[PDB]
């Protein structure tokens, strides 16, 4: 068994920049190393094979290199079409394992703070016995954001789920939804529902709240 150790797991780079993606084989795989690129919701496509040969159609800004059990994919002068995920794979002995992957996202030139909004549960949903509270963080960069739910100023845990959009191709930002779900009975124990957001674009955390019954 030969495993491929890939790094880094994530890369942020701007158009025109150069990046290096690395894979170490846990044993000699000779030159039997391929690289693939995969765009969201598409099948992977072959970029490089025999460690250093470019596949048909692949631009020369891509290069593969080999140094013993260390293999590298380098991309010079990144273009918009280059963003996505990359995987190495060896073909020496069974099983023919893949590296764990590298996600290459676009580094927006400037930080963008999220615009934050909080949505109370509706009268209609409340009828049915459940209360979903939704916090929206809109068009932010970079990806890292902390969203914390507080109920009557008490910190919540284990009762919310987050979802995030694909980086916008045009402005390079993300948006995120965090949903707090409570039974009606639990919802009715408390008054102040708030989401507090921490992010590099905010000199201080931002808190949006409502009072149950206010709307």
């Amino acid at each position: 068994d030969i495993q491929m150790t890939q790094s880094p797991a994530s890369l942020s780079a701007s158009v025109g920049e150069t990046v290096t993606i690395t894979c170490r084989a846990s044993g000699n795989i000779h030159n039997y190393l391929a690289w693939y690129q995969q765009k969201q919701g598409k099948s992977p496509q072959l970029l490089v094979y025999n460690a250093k040969t470019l596949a048909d159609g692949v631009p020369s800004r891509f290069s593969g290199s080999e140094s013993g059990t260390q293999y590298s994919l380098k991309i010079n002068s990144l273009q918009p079409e280059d963003f996505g995920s990359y995987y190495c794979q060896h073909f020496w002995s069974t099983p023919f394992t893949f590296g764990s992957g590298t996600k290459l996202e676009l580094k927006r030139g400037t930080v963008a703070a999220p615009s934050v909004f909080i949505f109370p549960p509706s009268d209609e949903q409340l009828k049915s016995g459940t209360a979903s509270v939704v916090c929206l963080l809109n068009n932010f960069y970079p990806r890292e954001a902390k969203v914390q739910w507080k109920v009557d100023n008490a910190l919540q845990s284990g009762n919310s789920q987050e979802s995030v959009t694909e980086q916008d191709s045009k402005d390079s930002t993300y948006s995120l939804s965090s949903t707090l779900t409570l039974s009606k009975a639990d919802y009715e124990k408390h008054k102040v529902y708030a989401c507090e957001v921490t992010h590099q674009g905010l000199s201080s955390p931002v808190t949006k709240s409502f009072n149950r019954g206010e709307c």
Binding site: S43, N50, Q125, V134, K208
Partner: protein, 216 residues
């Protein structure tokens, strides 16, 4: 044109078996090894095994030796993978691939079959408005699309006329086995008194169509 054709999706129950197909065309089927690759939602590629269609020789990844069973039908130039005793851990996109003239490559990939393993029954979504109690130049509105199965739903705003600033989030699978998603839109505060906002939610599997006006 070398092509590998795979069904888009298989919705199946836990504990059963499912047979995935990969129909090859545009080349001599018996000349090239066929491989299969697993990819769980938002995660990495995993190599399952390979079969030689000429003689039926097969090498599995040990991890999949009981889970996956590979065969081909020479006469219909089709490769098959049976996945047995299905569990939620098997929900994933499964690709078939064909080796190149350099055997140590996958230049050709099927589009992949999305296999979702679930015991849930079809159910249309409830659609709830999202509007803050609320100054600012931008206002947000949305719809919560809750408790439906299976994927997917389509959400549009004002019958497709409103697309700018619309964000429809990836659905999350709740412990109930049902999905939940929000779709939001940000608009100029000034429009709030002049313009109307409606999310249109469509769920084919249940034949459900909901249009929900969101009152700011």
């Amino acid at each position: 044109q070398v092509q590998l054709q795979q069904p888009g999706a298989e919705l199946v129950q836990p504990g059963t078996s499912v047979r995935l197909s990969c129909k090859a065309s545009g080349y001599i089927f018996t000349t090239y090894w066929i491989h299969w690759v697993k990819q769980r939602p938002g995660q990495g590629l995993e190599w399952i095994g390979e079969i030689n269609p000429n003689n039926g020789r097969i090498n599995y990844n040990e991890k999949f030796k009981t889970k996956a069973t590979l065969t081909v039908d020479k006469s219909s130039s089709t490769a098959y993978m049976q996945l047995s005793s299905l569990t939620s851990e098997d929900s994933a996109v499964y690709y078939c691939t064909r080796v190149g003239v350099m055997i140590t490559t996958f230049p050709y990939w099927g589009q992949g079959t999305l296999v979702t393993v679930s015991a849930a029954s079809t159910k249309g979504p409830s659609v709830f408005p999202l509007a803050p109690c609320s100054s600012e130049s931008t206002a947000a509105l949305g719809c919560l699309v809750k408790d439906y199965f299976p994927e997917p739903v389509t959400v549009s705003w004002n019958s497709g006329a409103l697309t700018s600033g619309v964000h429809t989030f990836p659905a999350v699978l709740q412990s109930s086995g049902l999905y939940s998603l929000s779709s939001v839109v940000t608009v100029p505060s000034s429009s709030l008194g002049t313009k109307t906002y409606t999310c249109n939610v469509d769920h084919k599997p249940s034949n459900t169509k909901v249009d929900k006006r969101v009152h700011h």
